[PDB]
Structures are given as structure tokens and as C-alpha cells.
Design a protein around this ligand. Structure first.
Ligand SMILES: O=C(O)CNC(=O)C(=O)O
Ligand SMILES: [Mg+2]
Ligand code: NI
Ligand SMILES: [Zn+2]
Length: 331
């Protein structure tokens, strides 16, 4: 069995290997990359996402979200307070302001220490989940706006035609902006490209151990757990690496830099934070190996999680027994 310790692997495809996306994901899994829950893909040196980022300031962040924490430094929740719209240019200025800028630090490890010590005492502002793409239309390889759709995959594998579309999202981050412990909708894969700016640190639990994380989460967030049997789907809970280690939860960590892709694999719980002003693009996708995960994905039916139009058909076809209760949660 490849990669039995579930380490995060880093891949360096050649330009030729970068042509066929599906093939390369299949290659990565042949070498055991999925066991980690997360992989890093460094594009060939010949490749570019687009010519420059000089013209992005007029993009609008319609609903910036201020991320307010409650709890203790290593175990906390966050809620998203809606703020007034601003442009990417206005947002970058805010990120670079004294109130929000990255502090002086020695290296990534120092900055990680400062993040876990001090995150709860600030409320950074995140531009998340903005429908759109920064890939040039002429970029033919690993263009996140031109991937095969999840609906087509399900069609190809299972023969059923379904409604729905699948498009990318832009994330504009600053220091301390945070992504809570989660798996993807329907335990899908995700792919994330860091277009520009400061790094993003990731933490990930191997899919084969995700239930160990869930059991700890229920212990650490007991009221949340009583309200919903899948409350990690709410995407509000944070647990530090120090707390994971104290409770024996297997996990790994890696920092993503500008120009790099990260792939998250089905049922790979992940969480993380941004180092300073950045812009990432991400999209869910599927492979044939996903189908089994999709059939077994937990669902939030308490009403909090509230998700895209396109998840209806996934639940309807893969999880018909759950469908009625889950849709009541949606409505
Ligand atoms: O970048 C972020 O804030 C969150 N991204 C993801 O969780 C992902 O790509 O799966
Ligand atoms: Mg612009
Ligand atoms: Ni994710
Ligand atoms: Zn719920």
C-alpha cells in the first residue's frame, strides 16, 4: 500500500504531464497521495495562469465577512458578520493597514505560532465565495474554469442526467482570515490555486481517520453536536494543532505559496489560515473513485449548512433515503 503513513505529497508534473487533468489525479492516487487528504502540485515552469494581476482591483467583493471568534485560543468557533461591499483594491488597502497587516515575524513557523496564540483577539475580514475566475481563457492546462463538471461525471459513471452547474469561486484573504474544519459538500474533491500574494497554511486529517476528528469535535463543541449530527458542515469550528496532538488526532500541515495548487481528496477534513493579502481560486470536482464517498457523505439537515442549488441532485440520486429530510433542512 502506497503512502501508509498518510503524508502530504508534493508533485512536480512536466508540461507534458500537465495536459490531461484526470490522468494526473489518477497518477497521484496511484502513488498514495489521497491517503493524506491533501496534495501540493507545483506547475511546470513553462505554465502560467494568466499574463499579470495588474488589472484586478475593480473586482467587487459584494459581501465581505468579518470573522468573529468565541472560545479559547486553541478551540473556538467563528461567525461571519456581513460588511458593506468594497472593491478588491479597497480590500487590499484594508489588509495592508496597521489594524490588519501581518506582524513582523521570522519565518512561517513563527507566524503559525502567532496565529494560534492571537487569532481569537482579532476579527479579520474575508472576501469569500465570490463566483468567478482569474484564469486566462487561453490557459489550456489546469484551468479551474474548464474542468469537467461533476454532473457530467455522475452521468458518465451512473447513467443519470441531472440539472446543475459547477463553477469556480474566488477568495480574497488577509492575515488571520480562517477556514474552519470541514470536508467538501458531498465529500467532493477540491482544487485550490493561489493566484497571488501571501501564503495559506493548511491542516488536514487523513480520510481514513476523519471519524476521529468528528468524535473530538463532538466532545469540544457539545451544544453544537446536540443541535446537529453533522455540525462540521456549518464550517464554524477551529481546533489547533496543539489540541489535535494532545488528543492523538492524526493530521499533517503544509504551507501553500503563490503559484501552487492544492488538491483536497474525498472526506479529507481540512482547516487553515492566510498569512496576509492574497487571492485564491477554488472549485469542487469529482472522479470515479468519489462516487462511493458521495453515497456515504453525512448531511446537515438542521438548517444551518444551506448549500448550492446543484447539491440537490447529488443527494436526490446518491442518497434517496436522506433526500426528504435533507431538503426540509434546505427550505
Ligand atoms: O481557501 C479557503 O479559504 C478555503 N478553501 C478550501 O477549503 C478548499 O479549497 O477546499
Ligand atoms: Mg478589475
Ligand atoms: Ni475546502
Ligand atoms: Zn446542521
Amino acid at each position: 500500500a502506497q503512502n501508509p503513513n498518510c503524508n502530504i505529497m508534493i508533485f512536480h508534473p512536466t508540461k507534458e504531464e500537465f495536459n490531461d487533468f484526470d490522468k494526473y489525479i489518477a497518477y497521484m492516487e496511484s502513488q498514495g497521495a489521497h491517503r493524506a487528504g491533501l496534495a501540493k502540485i507545483i506547475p511546470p515552469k513553462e505554465w502560467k495562469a494568466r499574463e499579470t494581476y495588474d488589472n484586478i482591483s475593480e473586482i467587487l467583493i459584494a459581501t465581505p465577512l468579518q470573522q468573529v471568534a468565541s472560545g479559547r485560543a486553541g478551540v473556538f468557533t467563528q461567525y461571519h458578520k456581513k460588511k458593506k461591499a468594497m472593491t478588491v483594491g479597497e480590500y487590499r488597502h484594508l489588509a495592508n493597514s496597521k489594524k490588519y497587516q501581518t506582524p513582523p515575524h521570522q519565518n512561517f513557523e513563527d507566524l503559525e505560532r502567532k496565529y494560534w496564540k492571537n487569532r481569537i483577539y482579532n476579527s479579520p475580514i474575508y472576501g469569500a465565495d465570490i463566483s468567478g475566475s482569474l484564469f486566462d481563457e487561453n490557459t489550456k492546462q489546469w484551468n479551474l474554469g474548464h474542468l469537467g463538471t461533476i454532473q457530467d461525471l455522475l452521468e458518465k459513471e451512473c447513467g443519470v442526467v441531472i440539472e446543475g452547474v459547477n463553477t469556480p469561486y474566488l477568495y480574497f484573504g488577509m492575515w488571520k482570515t480562517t477556514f474552519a474544519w470541514h470536508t467538501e459538500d458531498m465529500d467532493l474533491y477540491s482544487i485550490n490555486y493561489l493566484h497571488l500574494g501571501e501564503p495559506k497554511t493548511w491542516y488536514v486529517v487523513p480520510p481514513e481517520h476523519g471519524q476521529r476528528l468528528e468524535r473530538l469535535a463532538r466532545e469540544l463543541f457539545p451544544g453544537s453536536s446536540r443541535g446537529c449530527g453533522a455540525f462540521l458542515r456549518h464550517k464554524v469550528a477551529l481546533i489547533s494543532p496543539t489540541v489535535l496532538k494532545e488528543n492523538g488526532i492524526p493530521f499533517n500541515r503544509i504551507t501553500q505559496e503563490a503559484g501552487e495548487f492544492m488538491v483536497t481528496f474525498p472526506y479529507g477534513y481540512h482547516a487553515g489560515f492566510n498569512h496576509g493579502f492574497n487571492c485564491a481560486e477554488a472549485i469542487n470536482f469529482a472522479t470515479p473513485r468519489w462516487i462511493d464517498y458521495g453515497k456515504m457523505a453525512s448531511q446537515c439537515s438542521c438548517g444551518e449548512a444551506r448549500v448550492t442549488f446543484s447539491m440537490d441532485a447529488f443527494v436526490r440520486i446518491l442518497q434517496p433515503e436522506r433526500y426528504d429530510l435533507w431538503k426540509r433542512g434546505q427550505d
